[PDB]
Design an enzyme around this catalytic site. Structure first.
Site, mmCIF file in Angstrom:
data_model
loop_
_atom_site.group_PDB
_atom_site.id
_atom_site.type_symbol
_atom_site.label_atom_id
_atom_site.label_comp_id
_atom_site.label_asym_id
_atom_site.label_seq_id
_atom_site.Cartn_x
_atom_site.Cartn_y
_atom_site.Cartn_z
ATOM 1 N N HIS A 199 -9.467 5.446 -16.838
ATOM 2 C CA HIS A 199 -9.695 6.466 -17.666
ATOM 3 C C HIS A 199 -10.641 6.073 -19.045
ATOM 4 O O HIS A 199 -10.793 6.866 -19.603
ATOM 5 C CB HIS A 199 -8.441 7.126 -18.076
ATOM 6 N N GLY A 259 -4.610 4.115 -28.671
ATOM 7 C CA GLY A 259 -5.301 2.714 -28.690
ATOM 8 C C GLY A 259 -4.485 1.847 -27.816
ATOM 9 O O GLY A 259 -5.079 0.827 -27.390
ATOM 10 N N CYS A 282 -3.397 1.823 -24.690
ATOM 11 C CA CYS A 282 -3.633 1.938 -23.208
ATOM 12 C C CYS A 282 -4.330 0.604 -22.727
ATOM 13 O O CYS A 282 -5.137 0.032 -23.575
ATOM 14 C CB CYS A 282 -4.550 3.207 -22.756
HETATM 15 O O1 LIG Z 1 -1.473 9.147 -23.961
HETATM 16 C C1 LIG Z 1 -1.906 9.260 -24.905
HETATM 17 N N1 LIG Z 1 -3.569 9.135 -25.271
HETATM 18 C C2 LIG Z 1 -4.573 9.419 -24.060
HETATM 19 C C3 LIG Z 1 -4.176 10.119 -22.918
HETATM 20 C C4 LIG Z 1 -5.338 9.891 -22.192
HETATM 21 C C5 LIG Z 1 -5.421 10.488 -20.773
HETATM 22 C C6 LIG Z 1 -5.601 9.484 -19.961
HETATM 23 C C7 LIG Z 1 -5.306 9.983 -18.546
HETATM 24 C C8 LIG Z 1 -4.655 11.338 -18.546
HETATM 25 C C9 LIG Z 1 -4.061 11.405 -20.127
HETATM 26 N N2 LIG Z 1 -6.260 9.481 -22.931
HETATM 27 N N3 LIG Z 1 -5.602 9.027 -24.074
HETATM 28 C C10 LIG Z 1 -1.063 8.898 -26.341
HETATM 29 C C11 LIG Z 1 -1.130 9.894 -27.313
HETATM 30 C C12 LIG Z 1 -0.321 9.724 -28.469
HETATM 31 C C13 LIG Z 1 0.365 8.362 -28.551
HETATM 32 F F1 LIG Z 1 1.240 8.453 -29.709
HETATM 33 C C14 LIG Z 1 0.371 7.478 -27.739
HETATM 34 C C15 LIG Z 1 -0.320 7.744 -26.651
HETATM 35 N N4 LIG Z 1 -0.427 6.687 -25.557
HETATM 36 O O2 LIG Z 1 -1.346 6.426 -24.836
HETATM 37 O O3 LIG Z 1 0.697 6.226 -25.250
#
Ligand SMILES: O=C(Nc1cc(C2CCCC2)[nH]n1)c1ccc(F)cc1[N+](=O)[O-]
Ligand SMILES: O=C(Nc1cc(C2CCCC2)[nH]n1)c1ccc(F)cc1[N+](=O)[O-]
Ligand code: NA
Lengths: 305, 301
Positions: free
Chosen positions: A41, A143, A145
């Site tokens: 992604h 951040g 991921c």
């Molecule tokens: O998931 C988050 N961000 C994302 C998701 C995506 C896409 C990628 C495929 C479907 C979704 N891109 N960025 C997220 C949001 C808030 C937070 F406190 C923590 C996270 N995190 O990452 O664990």
């Protein structure tokens, strides 16, 4: 004495974490030998993420569209391909700190350490279990991921998890290092939800054994049970079934503490039906299910890496 | 989202752990630059345990009585001295993995990561807090002495704890890296007992702020309290006094959530009175006191 939620020492994995940038997205990658692994992604814009065609997005990219930094040093990307939901960036230098490692897929109930990372820099380490609903209850911000999960089995690092996304309930979803999701999730911005979760019975029993080893014995009783009777109770309280293999795995702890597994099941039955009556076990007022039998033996015996 | 008891990544400390042997006793040491730090009780015999005279035991030792192993490599000890309850062994190799570091003495309520070690090899990492009674509730077996506690704010390792012993209640006592004990303890097998332990009030409040940040408001109420009335109530549940310093320290979390510090104190009062009535806060059925205000801001952003 004492019993704590304990992670593996993270040093061998710290030396593998890098920063991966593609366009306006920065996230973490895992650098092993001459390949950097990260979520596919990374190549999506926000619009793409609604309904991505990954093959089509990727064919438009050159090697130089992927900026990879290992600390303060740029790595040169010399190839790129996809395996399921992970992107593999071939680089021109083998990581000199590559540990002995394998890629393993774990089963629900199994625990691992997560090295939470931001901008390729490790920030924190904690222990997680793969829930029966295939989520993890992690702690992750934007951040994170590409952060990874692992066990250490000897001097071999078994990588089992790469972080991809947070679900609406605030629990976390990701893949093994071959890019296959744990659970019925997809890497797309669409409505997705964690299924109703259950308690990991075998792990609760392991933790009750840990409590006994550490002198916390108030919940023991004179009674025993059968697997079938206990399983009817488990089902009523949204506990996973206990199998004979689970009983076998707890064999050592049963022999060490003098409490047969079905004797300990009668303790657990009473706790489910009656509660804790104001008492705690190992400092908790809830039954803890994120220690495996192996975890308990390891921590009660001082195994090192 | 989420909220976990999270330790610092242990790699920078792992690279400093060595095994120290004197006679039949083996424990862990910390190798920084060309010095190995370890508990001075490594030089005690079975006889010595109650009333060791460390100056007298040490003067009888030569450099070659101390075996230091770093992985598979023996280090050569070229000097030794004692500082308070730590032994400092000068060695003929600077550790090439020495991180940026400092030594800090911490106050009760402060949290740190512990790298539990046996035979100079790391076993595991977990988070601890210095209890009000100057003990820590660790997980340590025989052989864990010389394991250290640390923070890594930035890229600099702050070493704050070295493990020395387990008390009869199964809690743990140790020193700063200058060898001064936390609390009234001594490195002798004489009868000693930790003071009655109390809950770290400021940390519980921080953790309630964490729950609000993460979307949980069920435990709030419409009331406020004076600081003095809060303390009068909380002391009855074995909570530490909250001071004006603590109120000041909670200011940022208060500003972020819109809940005044004394309003949060009123919530805590009611929780102590009522319990949780089958509910949880951030996955716990008890009030958690091993997250500092600094920890909450770091983890939640
Ligand atoms: O998931 C988050 N961000 C994302 C998701 C995506 C896409 C990628 C495929 C479907 C979704 N891109 N960025 C997220 C949001 C808030 C937070 F406190 C923590 C996270 N995190 O990452 O664990
Ligand atoms: O405290 C222990 N061992 C010690 C104490 C001393 C004394 C000699 C005089 C002052 C220190 N030497 N070795 C200990 C014992 C059992 C256990 F499960 C854990 C520990 N521990 O360390 O955390
Ligand atoms: Na029983």
């Amino acid at each position: 004495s004492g019993f704590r939620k304990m992670a593996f020492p993270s040093g061998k994995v710290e030396g593998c974490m890098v920063q991966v940038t593609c366009g306006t997205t920065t996230l973490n990658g895992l650098w092993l030998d001459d390949v950097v692994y990260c979520p596919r992604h990374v190549i999506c814009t926000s619009e793409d993420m609604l309904n991505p065609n990954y093959e089509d997005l990727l064919i438009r990219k050159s090697n130089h569209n992927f900026l990879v930094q290992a600390g303060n040093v740029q790595l040169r990307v010399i190839g790129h391909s996809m395996q399921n939901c992970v992107l593999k960036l071939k680089v021109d230098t083998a990581n000199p700190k590559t540990p002995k490692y394998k890629f393993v897929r774990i089963q629900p109930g199994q625990t691992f350490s997560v090295l939470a990372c931001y901008n390729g820099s490790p920030s924190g380490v904690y222990q997680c279990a793969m829930r029966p609903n295939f989520t993890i209850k992690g702690s992750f911000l934007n951040g994170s991921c590409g952060s990874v999960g692992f066990n250490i089995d000897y001097d071999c690092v078994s990588f089992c998890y790469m972080h991809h996304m947070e679900l609406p309930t605030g629990v976390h979803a990701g893949t093994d290092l071959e890019g296959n999701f744990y659970g019925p999730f997809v890497d797309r911005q669409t409505a997705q939800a964690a299924g109703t979760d259950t308690t990991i019975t075998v792990n609760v029993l392991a933790w009750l054994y840990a409590a006994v080893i550490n002198g916390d014995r108030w919940f023991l009783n004179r009674f025993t049970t059968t697997l079938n009777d206990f399983n009817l109770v488990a089902m009523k309280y949204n506990y996973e079934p206990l199998t004979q293999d689970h009983v076998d795995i707890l064999g050592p702890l049963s022999a060490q503490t003098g409490i047969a597994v079905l004797d300990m099941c009668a303790s657990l039955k009473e706790l489910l039906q009656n509660g804790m009556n104001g008492r705690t076990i190992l400092g908790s007022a809830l039954l803890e299910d994120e220690f495996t039998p192996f975890d308990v033996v390891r921590q009660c015996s001082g195994v090192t890496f």
